[PDB]
């Protein structure tokens, strides 16, 4: 459950991501695929090689969904119902994999926005990504 | 465990870590991001705000002991269950720290490493470090096995 | 994220608890303390002896606190604010302990309400207790 | 795991009453219903689309008997769960890559199923003993991860 401070930390940090959201999404993927190879079984049809165009494009889609979640942080289950259907009903992703991706996203953000990634903001982003993960892995339809 | 290239990239990087800061930043971040871990440090003092935690000298002092413990596992990458057997008994038999928290701290340390080294903390480097912290988490949980 | 049907199941199931609120909460407690002894470290000021009048009474408020949560299911953050303060801010209960009490509540329900403990209801109650758990273990205030 | 003698007797007497043709299938069915991502490991089982589908699914029932039998072997080999599950540890860990939290989930679903079947006879001391067992079994299943 996000506090008031949490929600303004996330929106301001995500602001600072700017036009690099897609870059950061793709790097988080790559990091997750290299650090946690089991996660690759969810994309058997992806070219996963280093610098894969398919990974860069997917990264942009994840960034864009996260951006939408930031915009709708107070009504995530309505805003994310399409994605919840995809990940919870169809793919049936194990929630451990969301923790892995969320971790790799925090690593990516820490590496690129060191000034933003204070301890308070780290905490807020962790809770944000855990909230997103809960929506996407819950069948509430 | 670590491929030759993996082993060499991790030890190059570890050489540059600031041993007087990184330890304290990872524990402080553990106590900030996962606040229930504060319950294990009632003697450490003020933990009421993020800035309070990261300023705590007992937090910083304590964080250096973990950093050195991690540096031990690196020097004994093949024999970790034993390197931490004492640590394991302390945390498991005496403190009863739920071992999920071991995984949490290792992933915070990885964040801290990314925070300090920027682009130098490449995905291949992180992948090697994730092997390390998992091994430390697993060796530290050995008494639970 | 609780669905429509999950909310109906929880109300139907937990409703069938009734006057046994205190009894089931006490036994779930007893089950946690016996199966997971570390959970007792949060009750050193408690006589945990079998049949303790403290445990017994404690368990009644939890059933009632649960009942209150079922009553404000769609607004648990506000409705449980005070219990959040205690568990998250004051006590700093590690979230694993909530998974243990949750599991013991489910065990207690299955043992005392077999006809109602269908798989669907089982899943709904698991989610609801997970919902109550995250609200109680996070700082949003 | 170390069960006191009283616990072993209690555990063994309740287990002897278990319906070996259904409990395993109820436990697996509930795992697939309560934690739907586990269905991902059983696509070749056919209809898993509804709780009614899953519970009545013949392949989930048949496979539940095997799992139950695995727990039965463990109950007679408490002193060496590790070796007992040597074979299976490799299967789930190396070949199958099941996240070990799912081992804990199934054990706890099984405890729920035993409470479902036995009611007041599934007392807190009896649960405490079974929780030791399923943690013993889950640990040993996860050993090729240690
Ligand atoms: C922050 C967490 C996540 C977000 C925001 C997210 C978002 C998205 C989005 C926007 C799509 C595009 C769906 C479409 O093309 O219409 C997608 C597809 C997909 N996602 Fe996720 N995802 C997340 C986590 C995960 C994780 C952890 C996994 C597996 C480890 C996963 C597996 C997939 C798969 C397999 C697809 C389908 C890919 C395809 O067929 O193109 N997602 N996701
Ligand atoms: C995950 C890797 C970890 C490592 C490598 C580690 C290492 C250490 C070391 C070296 C010590 C000092 C040993 C001594 O003073 O004799 C220590 C003590 C301690 N550890 Fe950890 N630790 C880890 C995780 C954790 C976690 C997650 C917690 C709690 C959430 C924790 C709680 C404690 C406490 C409470 C002490 C003693 C504190 C006091 O002096 O009051 N440890 N640990
Ligand atoms: C569904 C889960 C839970 C619910 C609904 C719940 C609800 C409550 C309620 C209503 C109270 C007392 C409120 C009052 O004083 O009026 C309470 C107190 C307490 N809870 Fe919980 N609780 C839950 C889980 C837990 C867990 C898992 C723990 C620790 C293992 C815990 C530890 C405590 C303690 C230590 C107290 C105060 C005891 C005292 O007054 O001395 N709670 N809880
Ligand atoms: C926790 C205790 C568990 C026990 C005692 C257990 C036991 C077994 C046994 C005895 C088999 C038969 C293998 C053979 O006959 O050679 C089996 C197969 C299998 N297990 Fe488990 N298992 C457990 C947990 C899990 C979990 C949690 C999952 C997935 C979420 C899982 C997935 C599978 C799969 C996919 C198979 C093979 C299915 C097929 O035939 O295609 N197991 N398990
Ligand atoms: C483990 O499975 C579940 C599923 C659900 C659904 C759940 O809801 C927690 C919850 C309830 C009410 C309001 N907010 C929240 C919450 C906290 C963090 N994010 N969120 C939103 C994503 C809903 C918790 N755990």
List keywords for this structure.
heterotetramer; A: 141 residues; mainly alpha; Globin-like; globular; B: 145 residues; 8 helices; 70% helix; binds protoporphyrin IX containing FE; binds the ligand COc1cc(C=O)c(OCc2cccnc2-c2ccnn2C(C)C)cn1; oxygen transport
Summarize the structure.
Chain D: Involved in oxygen transport from the lung to the various peripheral tissues. LVV-hemorphin-7 potentiates the activity of bradykinin, causing a decrease in blood pressure. With 141 residues, chain A is an all-alpha fold.
What can you see in these coordinates?
The complex is a heterotetramer, with 2 copies of chain A (141 residues) and 2 copies of chain B. Helices cover 71% and strands 0% of the residues of chain A. Chain A is mainly α. Chain B has 145 residues and is mostly helical. Chain B has a single domain (1-145), classed as Orthogonal Bundle (Globin-like). Chain B is built from 8 helices and no strands. The interface between A and B is medium-sized, with 22 and 22 residues. The complex binds protoporphyrin IX containing FE (HEM) (4 copies) and the ligand COc1cc(C=O)c(OCc2cccnc2-c2ccnn2C(C)C)cn1. The site of one protoporphyrin IX containing FE has 17 residues of chain A, from α3, α5, α6 and α7. Chain B: Pfam families: Globin. Chain B: The modification N6-acetyllysine is found at residues 58, 81, 143. Chain B: (2R)-2,3-bisphosphoglycerate binds at residues 1, 81, 142. Chain B: The record marks 6-7, 24-25, 28-29, 34-37, 44-45, 51-52, 55-56, 70-71, 73-74, 83-84, 91-92, 103-104, 109-110, 118-119, 121-122, 127-128, 139-140, 143-144 as: (Microbial infection) Cleavage. Chain B: The record marks 58, 81, 94 as: Not glycated.
